Amino acid sequence: LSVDDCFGMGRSAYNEGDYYHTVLWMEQVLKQLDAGEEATTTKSQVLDYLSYAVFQLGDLHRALELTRRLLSLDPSHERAGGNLRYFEQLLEEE
Amino acid sequence: GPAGPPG
């Protein structure tokens, strides 16, 4: 499986509401991107799926860390800014 | 909740 094929696997998982498997696939993609492998998939795309999926597993702190990374690499990302605000709000409540 | 990717 190429990086892009792993991405398509994770996207397929996500589209079915299987967030646990989305995380596994997207962590594999992100590992390969961060190791410098070439693909058409971008780190921003992977982080967008990965952050949301992690939050669905119940992990706010990790979802926030991933969203901050996403925003660092993609400041005009529509949803990442709104998500960051939402997650930061949840963090103040705990 | 957060907004995730469309598709």
Residue numbers in the entry:
A (entry chain A): 145 to 238
B (entry chain C): 3 to 9
Paper text:
In addition, it is shown here by crystallographic binding studies that the POG‐PAG‐POG peptide (with 4‐hydroxyprolines at Y‐positions 2 and 8) also adopts the PxGP mode of binding to PSB‐I as well as to PSB‐II. Calorimetric binding studies show that the affinities of these peptides are lower for PSB‐I than for PSB‐II, with, respectively, K D values of about 70 μM for PSB‐I and 20 μM for PSB‐II.
Collagen prolyl 4‐hydroxylase (C‐P4H) catalyzes the 4‐hydroxylation of Y‐prolines of the XYG‐repeat of procollagen. The α‐subunit provides the N‐terminal dimerization domain, the middle peptide‐substrate–binding (PSB) domain, and the C‐terminal catalytic (CAT) domain. There are three isoforms of the α‐subunit, complexed with a β‐subunit that is protein disulfide isomerase, forming C‐P4H I‐III.
